[PDB]
Nucleic acid binder design. Structure first.
Ligand code: SF4
Ligand code: MG
Ligand code: MG
Lengths: 1152, 261, 261, 261
DNA sequence: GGTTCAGCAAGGTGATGCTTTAGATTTTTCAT
DNA sequence: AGTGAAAAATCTAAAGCATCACCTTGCTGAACC
């Protein structure tokens, strides 16, 4: 293995010489130096002993830019727990199996997260096996893993035998840490966190590197950040190719100074320096370099990156169109991006340099920016966050603009660059680094990786502060046995309760109706003094005796609420609210003391000897369980297991030997067993899938280890601490802007941006806990925890719905929060003139206080305790009721769709529009997915931009009727007036083709038929490179044949006309036809049915549920809704029986 | 210890198959006067009243008043086990909730006996007041059930008018109007094909035909149905199984929203 | 208006019962020759004609050639209200803007009116190419319908061929090949099973059997099917008895001229 | 070269309807001993044996032992066009890879030949254990179909007892427990509705009513069915058709876990 | 007064429309 | 403004089941010899 060793050696000094010329000179001199951490990457730095070893290099920046790189040796980690009392000989066998492959094997006791009888101090102990290098680790992984899986079944069988009794390599019982990476485990055990000021001590060469945190320096230096963006030539109406097309312009943005390099081969003339300033806080200084060809352009780019040396490089969708194009244009011109700036593709298709963090704002817009889905492009993000409109330009017409005038095209390019760079540094750069101070991951991977693994990184940090061993990834278990005795097929927690109780247009100017029950109002009149008292004493944590102005706001409350009693039925303008905690669910963990490692059944709870009634050791909580399973019994499973033993069976390996029962893997025999039972109960038991829905109660123990609880506690109150610090520094800025103290105002602006970013990142992770818990297969995922949290969320939110149904018209129940309306005569927000000098004004929310007393009086819990001082043995008794349903403010509009059958509930579908017309949030609609048809996209945009017109329901449905009448009249006239060239783009649908034509086998579908037509177009040569996603339309003239066999591509229509005509007559099965124009072969019935289903499910059915006549009378209702509507409006009505016949008695068959 | 003999066992089949389709639960009452079933719909609109006495039940004795809340979606799956000529013997226990059946063949070749455990529930009681109940008409059950099943497709509700010129069954529907007239062919010695119509005033009242479908399922019990109506009252329908008893079934109407203001 | 007198009205209710899947909406044309339906189906394949001559009925009464475009399946749900022994009586109206149909029980005590407002659609009339076909066959519709519903479900395509000795119907499928041969009856004078074939030159055609037993199944209106057939022409399927029934189907050969290969 | 005649078409048409549910793929055996079919069902619990002796056919001349392996659902799909009166003929050749068969009528007019292909798969030929039957009941098939569809609704696991007094079916379940007794009929000399009891020692075991329904759907084969049982053997169902042959079912009982029993 | 053939009620049965279960396909969601 | 893969909603074919018109059969009544 000397050749691979010298290869990875050459890779090591290759990256080292790459970074030495790029500015990151090594820590080779003995001394002590400060720094701020930037990047983290694995490397293969050796030692002076010439022993093979993997190391890791950190990158440290300075406040003046005298950067450096520090490489320290560090071996990877691995844990194996073996059989008790015989762990010496397995470690000696492991050490003697490989001369020096293993680096060190040692054992130190630890604590298990789910070991019962933990009060007596029980211990479970692993052994640590360390290798000197990572590829030896993955080699041993591939060597041992199937043996581990097979021996795991042996250990499982042994456990079953032990349970029945209760009723050399094979000495290893389990193993962990095969999925944690190198750098990740590195940080987990050393606690070295990106974005923290550090100092390094390194005397001599034999000594390792010492690193120490310097956290008192709360300021952060600005890294040199280069944001860049390409534009490429292209042939029209086609995605550009990287083999023939070339770059006409690159635009880039380094630390406030901007440059633009342009190719003069295609561009007609030179470009002068210019200024572009959209807003006074966005400066646009720009210099222009012009090179004759693409080779000199990319050479100038490479040398300027080599000279300016940016640590962080910023793109927008860089991993998709940018890097393959520039890498291929380097490769064409005899160069490569590996050899001068070190940017190559990784295994996952993403581009990560060893020293320059390639960072992509599109993934942040997708993940954390809370923009509506389907609105993730750069223009939308710049309008939503930066508050300005980027200049638009058609890529189809940009090629002729590249030769007509270069100035406006240059302005577009630099506008793209400056939008990317300011959307970087104003919002997401301190946001990412604030996320980075708590997440132990290098910046490119912490932007790329998903939400669940971010929660995983935080829990691994707090897990190794608490010294616990990591649970593995939760695999799928084959043929789980129900306690009733049936094998399972699917096993699910609470099914995501979503309900659209009403549908209609809702605004702050519309007059809506209220049926007000005065009983809740009689409750509120005698509650409201204590409700505002508790709101001021808890949400502000100040005593009520501090304020003096209680009486006049109380009198305003009384006047408004008393003017609410005067009539139940009333009509005014409702304010639109969103009644919820932003993530109630973390507080549901907090106030219930929930954690995924402390929930068991009654059996092992009774096995623990410290059970006691009337104590906090035994608490129970409710949820509901779902299981789709197999109705066949348990004894029959042993019967069919015995009948499937010792017989001949076809091997899956071609021309293989006679296989037996023992070496069969679980998945193939699992499919065989599923087929056998599906055949057995297609005949005898009348069913194969039984869906049992039941309710369950779980007992949650005390905190054996409270690691999942104190993380959320400390993270929540550190979030509130950072919020308070940010507000304090915001007031400092709000005085400093009129102080006139430029350097100080700049530094406190930096401090308040830093504190705002920490607050925003903490808010995002607090929202991320729920998204982590709601998936299966996570390394800390408990089934019962997810069920408990979702069911208690449902119960609390339907209690809130039950109360709020009487103070207005609540609309949409959700797994996130009530989306409702409230009357405007109902008071909305109170300002308090408070004599306290720390706060002259206090903003308090009246629905917020009402929901706070709702969650306080509804749920009183005595399990909360505080541990202040262990020395005095004190224990204060108080209850934590921190469910803060924060009304986010009165919105401008709310749109709900309806459903296409009688009485079904929608699935997370609505639109919420904020006050300034900006689309606040959208969920569950057709614009979410970029596929389907774009015949529907323009209609949906033109209807959602047109609900903000008019004052009454008649006027808003008049405007929507105008929009739908326009678009259905374009459709109904067969789209005749406009030119037809864009119509082939507009109408056609584009479906991807993932597999080949022969992978599905004999199954035939629409995409299979389209691929067959494409094969019949040219031949097998197109099949050889059939990686293109197929576009198609639907034929009309062969009626009766199903639409799955009725798809024709548009590739036939670009061919030369005679073969088009002949082979179209071959397709349509009608050789007597005469016309060839695209007017009649379009299946306009299917298209108008699609647009009809859209206009039914968006507009007309909610209109019928909003007691108004149909805004589109030419689109008829469904039969059920037509029946219900024609039955409702007729005053002739059905009278019940309790009124026409009196009551004579009530009885029950009582027990004697 | 309750017994209830029935030699002509098809009539218990015919009553029980007419209450599965719109009653989920009805509570049988037993007393010395016989067996009664006074029970409302679960949709709380229309109500059943079985009354069977002891002059058709051959072997029959009962000394105590009690009730059993039988289920109707499951009892009419275990009574068609007998054929159309078997005899049926009900049995019950004082303290147990188990109702037993005995199906005996008339030729003594197939003997079966059944047990069924029951449950206790909590329903309401709606006693009837006594009124004029005029506009009484007598029709064949087959013709009335046939026309009631027929009018279900054209309309969803019916207007019934008892006037001098026969009886007016006019169903109201979106497609068309279907109306039925009954002629007074009183010059027939046979009571089957001769209808009797007596009245005190012309009465127009409307009813739900979607409930009239599940209503009219009790076809082959009596050869002649007797239906009667008045103003602002539920229609009364008697299916007289003259050997022991009769099915009275009461259907509440639809009315207007009084005088608007 | 064509409120004609019928001695028995079973024919109309069963042709509406059977043709509720062939035509989704038709128009009733009535002229001095009687009633002539010519409707083109939903899949736009065949043109179905029904001729019910006025002299076949008891009486005719119309102002002029009247075409009423009543939805064909809508009034099929209401036409089975009448019995097979029910009759349609006679009435006279000249300016009726709403068509009513009269229902009269065989015992002449029940009368009914079923109305339908006048709504109309204009359907283009298609010319019918008519000439002397080469082969006309005649078999009772019982066993022909029986084998047509027992051989369409083994194969989708049939080669139908006519020769002197016996006409054959050959369909292949994934479970095998089947074919039917019919000989000639010469010593048989009874109508119940005689298969008479008038024969000019042997013909071969290919057809889909799904359309033949399902969308074109109106068997009991007549008792003997006659198929007219020739070279390069579509099918002519005839259900024909006397003046009481004549219906016909025009399923076309959906065979291409070897453009697949 | 094989040839067979049937002067009746009921039995060969109805065996395929009787057997298509348990068996999807079978292996016929044609020889001088006749027709043999031993088969497992697709769950490998129940055993079937279709046996036809050579003397039952009108003329039955063959060559030698041939095992042929087409499936059964295709055969039932293609052959069910024959009625209960059409006469049957089948012919075959060794060199030919297909087997022909005509459905002909006695008037030599209605006639249809079908040729069927040979798809080849050979299942294992297991030896059927033949032992004594301790209890034999010979009872009508219509009453057996009625009692199986009777007990299908109440429960799923039927317990069957054979005793001196007769046979006793019993059904457990959540909707009650039913008990049916059938005693000896000694005063009835005619045997198309009576029962016959051969008795050695009392037995009782549990069987699955879905499988009993799958056996009892062979009911048009014979007016009587011979159920028989012995110690722990699969329960055997004998369908004594005629002198033509037998159709024998064998069902294993289900093992009840002693735990919680 | 025996006979006998037709009339009619009634069970069995093929055919049918609505309902319910089961397998393949897209769609959302989550990781990247 | 990318990608891939899994859980769930959706679409489609086949079996269950209650119902209806019709075929065949047992009981019975009135004309006949
Ligand atoms: S809840 Fe049960 S298992 Fe947990 S500590 Fe208490 S007694 Fe032990
Ligand atoms: Mg770009
Ligand atoms: Mg771009």
């Amino acid at each position: 293995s000397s050749v691979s060793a010298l290869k990875r050696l050459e890779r090591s000094q290759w990256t080292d010489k790459m970074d030495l010329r790029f500015g990151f000179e090594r820590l080779k001199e003995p001394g002590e130096k400060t720094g701020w951490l930037i990047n983290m990457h694995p490397t293969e730095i050796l030692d002076e002993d010439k022993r093979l070893g993997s190391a890791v290099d950190y990158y440290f920046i300075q406040d003046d830019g005298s950067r450096f790189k520090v490489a320290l040796p560090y071996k990877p980690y691995f844990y194996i727990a073996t059989r008790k009392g015989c762990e010496r000989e397995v470690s000696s066998f492991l050490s003697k199996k490989f001369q020096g492959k293993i680096a060190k094997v040692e054992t130190v006791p630890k604590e298990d997260l789910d070991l019962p009888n933990h009060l007596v101090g029980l211990k479970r102990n692993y052994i640590r096996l360390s290798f000197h290098t990572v590829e030896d680790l993955v080699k041993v992984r591939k060597e041992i893993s199937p043996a581990v899986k097979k021996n795991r079944e042996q250990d499982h069988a042994s456990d079953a035998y032990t349970a029945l009794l209760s009723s050399q390599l094979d000495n290893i019982v389990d193993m962990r840490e095969y999925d944690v990476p190198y750098h990740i485990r590195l940080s987990i055990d050393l606690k070295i966190h990106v974005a923290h000021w550090y100092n390094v001590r390194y005397r001599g060469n034999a000594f390792p590197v010492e690193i120490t945190r310097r956290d008192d320096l709360v300021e952060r230096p600005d890294p040199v950040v280069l944001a860049f963006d390409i534009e490429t030539t292209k042939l029209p109406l086609k995605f550009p190719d990287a083999e023939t097309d070339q770059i006409m312009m690159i635009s880039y943005m380094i630390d406030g100074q901007g440059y633009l390099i342009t190719n003069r081969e295609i561009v007609s003339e030179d470009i002068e320096d210019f200024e572009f300033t959209p807003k006074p806080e966005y400066e646009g200084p720009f210099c222009v370099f012009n090179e004759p060809d693409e080779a000199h352009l990319i050479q100038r780019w490479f040398e300027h990156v080599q000279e300016t040396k940016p640590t962080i490089m910023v793109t927008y969708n860089g991993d998709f169109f940018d890097w393959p194009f520039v890498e291929a244009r380097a490769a064409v011109h005899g160069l490569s991006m590996q050899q001068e700036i070190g940017f190559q593709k990784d295994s996952q298709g993403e581009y990560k340099a060893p020293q320059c963090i390639h960072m992509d704002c599109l993934r942040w817009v997708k993940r954390d920016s809370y923009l509506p889905v389907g609105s993730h492009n750069l223009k939308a993000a710049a309008k939503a966050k930066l508050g300005y409109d980027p200049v638009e330009l058609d890529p189809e017409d940009m090629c002729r603009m590249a030769t007509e005038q270069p100035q406006t095209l240059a302005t577009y390019s630099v506008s793209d660059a400056v939008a990317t760079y300011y959307l970087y540094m104003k919002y997401v750069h301190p946001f990412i680094f604030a996320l980075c101070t708590i997440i132990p991951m290098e910046p490119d991977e912490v932007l790329r990786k998903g939400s669940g693994t971010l929660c995983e990184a935080l829990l691994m940090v707090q897990a190794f502060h608490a010294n616990i061993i990591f649970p593995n990834k939760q695999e799928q278990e084959f043929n789980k046995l129900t306690d009733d005795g049936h094998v399972l097929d699917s096993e699910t927690y609470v099914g995501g309760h979503v309900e659209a109780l009403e549908s209609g247009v809702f605004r702050s100017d519309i007059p809506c109706r209220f049926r007000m029950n005065p009983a809740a109002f009689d409750f509120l009149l005698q509650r409201v003094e204590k409700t505002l008292r508790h709101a001021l004493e808890e949400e502000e944590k100040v005593p009520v005796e501090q304020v003096t102005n209680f009486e006049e706001v109380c009198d305003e409350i009384k006047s408004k609420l008393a003017s609410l009693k005067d009539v139940p039925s009333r009509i005014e303008c409702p304010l639109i609210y969103h009644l919820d905690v932003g993530a109630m669910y973390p507080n549901i963990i907090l106030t219930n003391r929930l954690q995924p490692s402390a929930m068991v059944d009654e059996a092992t709870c009774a096995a623990c000897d410290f059970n006691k009634p009337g104590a906090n050791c035994q608490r129970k909580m409710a949820w509901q369980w779902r299981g789709e399973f197999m109705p066949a019994s348990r004894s029959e499973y042993h019967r069919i297991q015995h009948q499937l033993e010792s017989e001949k069976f076809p091997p899956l390996f071609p021309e293989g030997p006679a296989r037996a029962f023992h070496e069969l893997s679980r998945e193939e025999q699992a499919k065989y067993e599923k087929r056998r039972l599906a055949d057995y109960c297609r005949k005898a038991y009348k069913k194969i899938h039984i869906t049992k829905v039941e309710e369950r109660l779980t007992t949650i123990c005390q905190r054996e280890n409270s690691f999942y609880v104190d993380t959320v506690r400390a993270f929540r109150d550190r979030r509130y601490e950072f919020k308070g610090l940010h507000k304090v520094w915001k007031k400092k800025l709000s005085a400093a802007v009129e102080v006139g103290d430029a350097a100080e105002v700049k530094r406190c602006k930096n401090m308040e941006v830093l504190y705002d970013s920490l607050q925003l990142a903490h808010k995002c992770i607090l929202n991320s806990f729920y998204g982590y818990v709601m998936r299966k297969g996570a390394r800390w995922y408990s089934m019962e925890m997810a069920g408990i949290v979702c069911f208690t969320g449902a119960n609390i939110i339907t209690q809130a719905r039950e109360l709020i149904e009487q103070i207005g018209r609540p609309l949409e129940l959700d797994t996130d929060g009530i989306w409702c309306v409230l009357p405007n005569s109902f008071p909305e927000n109170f300002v308090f003139k408070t004599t306290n000098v720390k706060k002259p004004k206090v903003t308090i929310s009246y629905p917020g206080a009402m929901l706070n007393i709702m969650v306080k009086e509804g749920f009183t819990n005595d399990q909360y305790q505080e541990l202040a001082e262990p020395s005095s043995l004190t224990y204060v008794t108080r209850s934590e009721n921190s469910i803060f349903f924060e009304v986010d403010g009165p919105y401008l509009a709310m749109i709900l769709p309806a459903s296409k059958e009688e009485g079904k509930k929608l699935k997370k579908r609505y639109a919420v529009f904020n006050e300034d017309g900006s689309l606040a949030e959208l969920k569950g609609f057709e614009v979410k997915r970029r596929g389907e048809l774009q015949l529907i996209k323009i209609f949906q945009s033109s209807v959602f931009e047109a609900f903000l017109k008019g004052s009454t329901l008649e006027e808003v449905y008049g405007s929507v009727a105008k929009v739908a009448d326009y678009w259905l009249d374009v459709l109904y006239s067969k789209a005749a007036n406009m030119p037809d060239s864009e119509l082939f783009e507009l109408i056609s649908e584009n479906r991807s083709m993932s597999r080949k034509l022969e992978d599905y086998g004999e199954q035939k579908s629409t995409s299979i038929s389209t691929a067959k037509r494409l094969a019949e177009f040219l031949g097998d040569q197109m099949v050889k490179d059939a990686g293109l996603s197929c576009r198609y339309i639907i034929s009309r003239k062969p009626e009766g044949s199903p639409v799955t066999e009725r798809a024709i591509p548009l590739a036939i229509f670009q061919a030369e006309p005679t073969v088009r005509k002949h082979f179209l007559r071959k397709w349509l099965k009608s050789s007597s036809l005469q016309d060839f124009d695209i007017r009649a072969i379009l299946d306009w019935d299917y298209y108008i049915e699609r647009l009809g289903s859209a206009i039914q499910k968006i507009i007309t059915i909610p209109a019928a549920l909003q007691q108004v006549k149909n805004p589109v009378p030419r689109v008829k209702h469904p039969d059920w809704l037509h029946k219900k509507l024609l039955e409702k409006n007729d005053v002739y009505k059905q009278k019940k029986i309790s009124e026409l016949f009196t009551l004579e008695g009530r009885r029950q068959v009582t027990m004697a | 210890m309750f017994e209830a003999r029935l030699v002509q066992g098809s009539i218990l089949k015919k009553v029980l198959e007419a209450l599965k389709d719109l009653i989920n639960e009805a509570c049988w009452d037993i007393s010395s006067s016989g067996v009664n079933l006074q029970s409302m719909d679960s949709s709380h609109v229309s109500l059943v009243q079985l009354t069977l006495r002891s002059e058709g039940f051959d072997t029959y004795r009962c000394d105590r008043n009690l009730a059993m809340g039988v289920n109707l979606t499951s009892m009419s799956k275990i009574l068609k086990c007998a054929g159309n000529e078997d005899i049926i013997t009900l049995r019950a226990e004082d303290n147990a909730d188990t109702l037993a059946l005995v199906f005996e063949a008339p030729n003594q070749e197939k003997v079966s006996d059944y047990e069924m455990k029951l449950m206790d529930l909590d329903v309401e009681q709606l006693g009837i007041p006594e009124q004029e109940y005029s506009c009484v008409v007598k029709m064949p059950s087959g013709e009335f059930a046939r026309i009631c099943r027929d009018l279900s497709h054209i309309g969803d509700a019916v207007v019934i008018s008892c006037a001098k010129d026969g009886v007016k069954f006019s169903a109201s529907g979106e497609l068309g109007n279907g109306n039925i007239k009954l002629s007074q062919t009183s010059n027939v010695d046979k009571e089957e094909e001769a209808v009797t119509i007596e009245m005190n005033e012309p009465v127009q009242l409307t009813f739900a035909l979607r409930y009239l479908n599940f209503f009219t399922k009790a076809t082959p019990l009596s050869s002649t149905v007797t239906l009667s109506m008045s103003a602002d009252v539920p229609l009364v329908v008697e299916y007289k199984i003259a050997d022991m008893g009769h099915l009275k079934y009461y259907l509440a109407p639809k009315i207007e929203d009084e005088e608007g203001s």
